[PDB]
Structures are given as structure tokens and as C-alpha cells.
């Protein structure tokens, strides 16, 4: 049952994000919206938290390819009812208020009711056979050095930022009974597809941020109390 390859670890489901869906949310409203890049979660800010297994492992490689799977678990009961539409968008992105632009792409409409979960394979449609990682191959900065344009100019590579997105919009407004909660949380999982690939070993993007202590000489280094 133990994973043999890096691709086996990428096939483990991991919680990316969470979003709320309420009865106040009008039709065509973006409940969820993100750039699907397993290289970096953000291009414009620091990340700190529990990254998904497929993102963690993709951080070790310079290249990735293949479909990415998603799973939307709705933390609800039987009395909650509504409809959403998941949409994989390519090349160009849609306006936040324009639902019709999202509907034109590769979509799956989910009728929430008794079933409180839906799977979604995101097709890999790019100009290249593989995508290079947005993160760096080698980063010698260890002590949070204040960056300048000269430092950026002398970087390892140039970040090819992805414009490909997945969005979740309201089709039918959530109409739960008065007895139950009006708003529900939706857990967004991700993993690599069955034909997910990785290549080009490099410096890891992610590194432990909690309870990091270097080893000392036991017992010479003041272990005898």
C-alpha cells in the first residue's frame, strides 16, 4: 500500500482550498476562481500552510504534464438544494460578471441534493506537450533578503505564468429549508490524473515551516544537565 514512485504520491487526494455557498449568492456569481498551476499557488504573494501532495511532489520537478483531477465535497445535508457549474477555461479568461463566457468552455453542471460530492477531470490542453515549472530551479536566498530588480534580473529563469483557470458559478440559487443553515462550506480537493507526469529533478519549492531545529552533538553539546 506504500507509494513506490512520486506519481503514486501525486495520485493522493489533497485539500487545496475552501469556499462558502449561501442563499444570498445570485446566479452567475463566482463561488470559486483560481489559476490551475501545480508549480505555484500564488504568483504575487507568499504561501504558508498544508500544501496538497501533488503540489509538494511537483515542486521537486522542473516539468509537469497530463490531466489534473478535482473533487468538490459540499458540507451539507439532504435539505440543502441548488445547482453549480464547474468550468475549465483555456488561453483567455472570463469576466467575473459574465457567466456566458465560462459556459462556452469545458463545463460540468452538478445538481446538489442527496449526493453531496462531484468529481471533475480537467483536460490538459496547451501549446506544448509539457509545461515548465513557474518556481525557480535554484534559489540561494536563505535569510529573506530584501529583493531588488538586479536580483530578479540575475534569476535562474523567467516565470511563464499560466492563464488557465477553473471556476465554479451559481446556476440555481441555493434554497435550503428554514430549519437548516443558509450557508454551506465546499471543500476543493486535487490530485494528478492517471496520466500525470513529472520530469527534471531540481531544488524543492516547498520546505518545512514548523518545528525546524538542526542537529547537535549528543551528548557533548550540553545534554548532561
Amino acid at each position: 500500500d506504500e507509494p513506490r514512485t512520486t506519481l503514486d504520491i501525486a495520485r493522493i487526494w489533497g485539500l487545496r482550498s475552501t469556499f462558502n455557498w449561501g442563499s444570498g449568492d445570485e446566479h452567475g456569481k463566482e463561488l470559486f476562481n483560481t489559476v490551475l498551476d501545480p508549480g505555484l499557488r500564488f504568483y504575487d504573494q507568499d504561501y504558508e500552510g498544508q500544501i496538497t501532495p501533488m503540489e509538494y511532489v511537483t515542486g521537486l520537478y522542473n516539468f509537469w504534464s497530463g490531466p489534473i483531477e478535482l473533487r468538490f465535497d459540499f458540507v451539507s445535508n439532504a435539505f440543502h438544494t441548488g445547482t453549480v457549474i464547474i468550468s475549465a477555461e483555456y488561453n483567455r479568461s472570463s469576466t467575473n460578471t459574465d457567466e456566458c463566457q465560462s459556459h462556452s468552455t469545458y463545463t460540468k453542471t452538478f445538481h446538489l441534493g442527496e449526493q453531496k460530492s462531484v468529481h471533475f477531470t480537467v483536460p490538459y490542453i496547451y501549446d506544448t506537450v509539457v509545461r515548465r515549472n513557474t518556481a525557480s530551479a535554484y534559489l540561494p536566498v536563505t535569510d529573506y533578503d530584501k529583493v531588488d530588480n538586479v536580483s530578479r534580473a540575475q534569476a535562474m529563469g523567467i516565470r511563464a505564468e499560466s492563464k488557465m483557470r477553473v471556476k465554479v458559478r451559481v446556476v440555481n440559487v441555493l434554497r435550503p429549508v428554514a430549519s437548516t443553515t443558509s450557508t454551506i462550506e465546499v471543500l476543493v480537493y486535487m490530485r494528478g490524473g492517471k496520466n500525470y507526469a513529472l520530469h527534471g529533478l531540481k531544488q524543492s519549492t516547498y520546505w518545512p515551516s514548523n518545528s525546524v531545529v538542526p542537529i547537535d552533538s549528543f551528548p557533548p553539546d550540553g545534554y548532561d544537565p
Binding site: E2, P3, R4, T5, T6, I9, I12, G14, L40, F42, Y43, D46, Y47, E48, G49, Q50, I51, T52, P53, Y56, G59, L60, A135, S136, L139, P140, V141, T142, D143, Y144, V147, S151, R152, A153, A155, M156, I158, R159, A160, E161, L201, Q203, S204, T205, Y206, W207, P208, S209, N210, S211, V212, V213, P214, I215, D216, S217, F218, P219, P220, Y223
Partner: protein, 211 residues
């Protein structure tokens, strides 16, 4: 996983060997969060980039490991002096760097390499580099990869279970060395722990494709 772990990881970058000591100790354990640098902590002989290697990232997920490790040691010299690399089995301690064993001030008459333990010599004039394979000479079934706190003073027998022994380098005269480490052919990992809490700031030190 095994293919990744069998490539070499650089541990020590140009570290001094001093003949006043017994030798430079290397604890037999793979690269992991145990050897990770944190900005602010005390300066060690270890390199800062061990934590961010592919293998270290893999070994953070598995808390058990069994089998042999392979150590590539390079002596920065072209002299005819022999530099000895002695293997110590699992005794129960965990040390690194230069150490005077039993705090003596003379070790040429009582060398560790001429005590009885398994030893191999490097002759830099012939070859300054060597690759030595250390066995799994321990009482335990598995060797523990990491702990939550490496510097915590807990039960002393359990404290030493993170290593399977030591590798001690002893020179004739003062000379520097560099050390790599990798997994052997006979090597396994187990006890999958899953991914820990992590941080990154790679975005900040690079331009986008739109200038």
C-alpha cells in the same frame, strides 16, 4: 523513490580535518529536515541547502529506513599521506564534526582506525576521492529518519536510534574535505507520514513573462 535517493547529496563543503582530534565524525543517516537550516539559528558545519534537496523532501515523508548508505569523500590534497575512514556500528550516540574521544590530547599513538574496527584509506596522490558503503549494523529493525525536535533531551537510548553508526575521517596533517551521501542498492524506506506544513518565497526572486 529509490532512483531519486541513490543520487548524491552534498553535506559538508570544504570542512577542516585536524590531527589533534580523533577524527571528523559523520552520523550514518540520510538527508532530511534534521539537517535543515533556519534563518537565525546557530551556524553549523552542515550546508544550508540540504533541506531543499529532492531526497530530503522525500525522506521527510518516510520516518523508517533500512539498508546501506554510500558516502563520497573528497580530500583537498595531492599528498602521499594516508587519510583513514573508519566505520563505527550503532553504539547509541549521535555526534558530528571534530571530537576528542574521552577528552584526550593525543591520538597518533591510539588511532581509531587501528583499534580493530573496519577501516579504508584514501591516498590523495593516487586518488583524492573515494566511495564507501556503510552496513546496517544496528539492533533495531528500522532506523528512525527524523524527530519533531532534534535538540530535545529525551530518553538516551531512543535518542540514538536515528543513526545506525558513524563514519570517522582521520588525517596525518591538517587538510580539508568535502562529503556527499546517497542510498545504497540494498536500501528501503517505509512508514509514510504524508506531507508536512511548508512555506515558499520563490515567486519574489523572479520576473514574470510580461516583464
Amino acid at each position: 523513490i529509490k532512483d531519486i535517493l541513490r543520487r548524491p547529496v552534498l553535506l559538508f563543503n570544504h570542512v577542516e580535518l585536524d590531527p589533534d582530534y580523533t577524527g571528523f565524525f559523520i552520523p550514518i543517516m540520510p538527508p532530511s529536515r534534521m539537517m535543515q537550516y533556519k534563518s537565525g539559528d546557530k551556524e553549523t558545519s552542515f550546508q544550508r541547502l540540504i533541506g531543499r534537496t529532492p531526497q530530503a523532501a522525500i525522506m521527510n515523508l518516510f520516518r523508517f529506513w533500512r539498508g546501506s548508505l554510500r558516502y563520497t569523500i573528497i580530500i583537498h590534497s595531492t599528498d602521499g599521506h594516508p587519510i583513514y575512514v573508519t566505520h563505527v556500528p550503532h553504539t547509541g550516540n549521535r555526534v558530528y564534526g571534530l571530537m576528542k574521544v574521552n577528552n584526550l590530547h593525543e591520538y597518533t599513538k591510539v588511532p581509531i582506525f587501528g583499534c580493530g574496527l573496519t577501516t579504508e584509506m584514501i591516498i590523495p596522490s593516487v586518488n583524492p576521492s573515494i566511495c564507501v558503503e556503510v552496513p546496517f549494523d544496528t539492533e533495531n529493525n528500522w532506523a528512525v529518519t527524523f524527530d519533531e525536535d532534534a535538540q530535545r533531551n529525551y530518553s538516551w537510548r531512543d535518542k540514538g536510534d536515528t543513526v545506525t553508526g558513524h563514519l570517522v575521517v582521520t588525517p596525518v596533517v591538517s587538510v580539508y574535505m568535502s562529503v556527499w551521501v546517497e542510498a545504497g542498492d540494498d536500501f528501503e524506506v517505509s512508514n509514510f507520514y504524508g506531507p508536512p506544513s511548508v512555506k515558499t518565497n520563490d515567486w519574489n526572486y523572479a520576473f514574470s513573462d510580461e516583464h
